[PDB]
Design a protein around this ligand. Sequence first.
Ligand SMILES: CN1CCN(C2=Nc3cc(F)ccc3Nc3ccc(F)cc32)CC1
Lengths: 264, 278
Amino acid sequence: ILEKLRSIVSVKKKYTRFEKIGQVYTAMGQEVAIKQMELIINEILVMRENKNPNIVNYLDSYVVMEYLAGGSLTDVVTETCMDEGQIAAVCRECLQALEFLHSNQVIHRDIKSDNILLGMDGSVKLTDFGFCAQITPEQSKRSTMVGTPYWMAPEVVTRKAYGPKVDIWSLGIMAIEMIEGEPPYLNENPLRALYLIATNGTPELQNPEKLSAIFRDFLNRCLEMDVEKRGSAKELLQHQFLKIAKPLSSLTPLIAAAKEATKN
Amino acid sequence: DEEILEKLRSIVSVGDPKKKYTRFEKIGQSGTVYTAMDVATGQEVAIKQMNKKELIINEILVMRENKNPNIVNYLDSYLVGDELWVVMEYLAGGSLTDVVTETCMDEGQIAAVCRECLQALEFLHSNQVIHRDIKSDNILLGMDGSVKLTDFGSKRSTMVGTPYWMAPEVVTRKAYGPKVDIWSLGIMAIEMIEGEPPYLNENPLRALYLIATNGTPELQNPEKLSAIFRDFLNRCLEMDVEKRGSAKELLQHQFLKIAKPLSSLTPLIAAAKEATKN
Ligand SMILES: CN1CCN(C2=Nc3cc(F)ccc3Nc3ccc(F)cc32)CC1
């Protein structure tokens, strides 16, 4: 245990109007979120270096993050029925965040609805960079099995050499959550889910006929077992499915519904 | 909200706790735990301060009526503002973690710690309490060698740390009973002879997989353990819950008969205090 974590800290007078939130506080001429509590160092380092509009802004540490008042995507997917135009809008935003991170040789390794925060204007931002991997030409692949079982790519689960396309798979599982309300095998135990991802491979939708052919194709490109065949974030940003995306304002009735449903 | 407040008034002791105890020092953050000293008697105490509400009334009443030498017992309770303070016993010899990471314990010392913990587990289980966190960090030592068990405090979310002490039935999210604490004691005994718990260099998710499949990992140096100690561990770390020993059965194990008196633990306390001074 070392103190070179004290070296990145900024060093009660800078922020006011503290109000406790979650299981994390809100404060203020901008509105901020302050999380008060070796991987914590990597998360602060990667967030400073990788600033983009589709990533929750790390502001300072003494951890001061920007505030997104519309909750997470989880509240929306578990309390509402999203249409394809809304799903395509969320997928486009996440792919813009992934295209940015991957070009900076960063693998998120934890893409899931819980890590997608929403703004009251419909803005979509990616968070939780604890599990991220910074790759390089000297070590372009990783092997560690990290992530949330239900969202993990089969190559991660089986501890094979993997790259940024593990995040593409996780995005594909997230789009399934947007359809079905839950990731595949959620009713199972996390270890039984790991076994199922490793053996079944590409998950099968409960009702595939409900989806348009263009959405089915988009998911097939995301959830392709052959990593070379699976699309990169840059390739999938050119997919026809994203062209049916509604403006980000279309997400605000969804935020309203989740807030109304979660009054307990 | 109101019924819980009135029920508390009849059970809490009158008097100002701020006048009764001194030298408050935070040791954890439901609520906050402070170490303190009784100004009148010199006793060292642990004070849990806190702002589900029906569950706490029963937990106090259980603690108050049920006493055991191998657990930190309930001493008193006070209503301080909108906070409830629960005063419990504490010990000055630190935790078992300091001893296992700074000294080499012999089997006679390990047996003495296992006997004390099993006496605490027998007591808790008869009171239909499953600890769930039996680990060296929750074992408190007294300057006379006394051993006391403490506590104090989702599939979508992330877990901080490897849950190395957890039984395979806990990991696989099955219904479970008090024998989960027996498994955890078995892991604690491994920590006592190797100086570390298993799955330390392992990722928490890889640890979960390993616990669920193989149960317990192979010992780093098994030839260093006596046959009677290896048998004791086999009974503790049995995958079949019915085959795994209960606290009452394991108190009759031959391994505990090689236990040295609790005075044999005081040189270990001295060494851990010397190692963790500066
Ligand atoms: C339902 N709820 C579970 C936790 N309980 C206890 N937990 C403990 C656990 C310890 F490790 C030390 C002391 C205690 N205090 C106790 C003292 C007597 C007793 F019978 C049980 C406990 C209280 C009841």
